[PDB]
Amino acid sequence: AKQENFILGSCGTDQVKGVLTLQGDALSQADVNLKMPRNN
């Protein structure tokens, strides 16, 4: 089997986290949380 879902970033270390679905050359989904502008 071939991975399709990828996790970018951590909760504590970064202020952006994302689960991006990459199918071949196509970014079919990019589901993103941004902890901005204040850190709460």
Number of residues that bind other proteins (CB under 8 A): 15
| Of residues 11-30, those binding other proteins (CB under 8 A) | 11-13, 17-19
Residue 33, both tokens: 């949380």
Q: In angstroms, what is the minimal distance from the CB of 8 to other proteins? A: 8
Nearest C-alpha neighbor of 19 from the set 34, 37, 38, 29: 29
Which residue in the set 4, 23, 27, 31 belongs to the binding site for other proteins (CB under 8 A)? 31
User: What DSSP string describes 10-31?
Assistant: -TTT-SEEEEEEEETTEEEEEE
Which residue in the set 23, 27, 28, 32 belongs to the binding site for other proteins (CB under 8 A)? 32
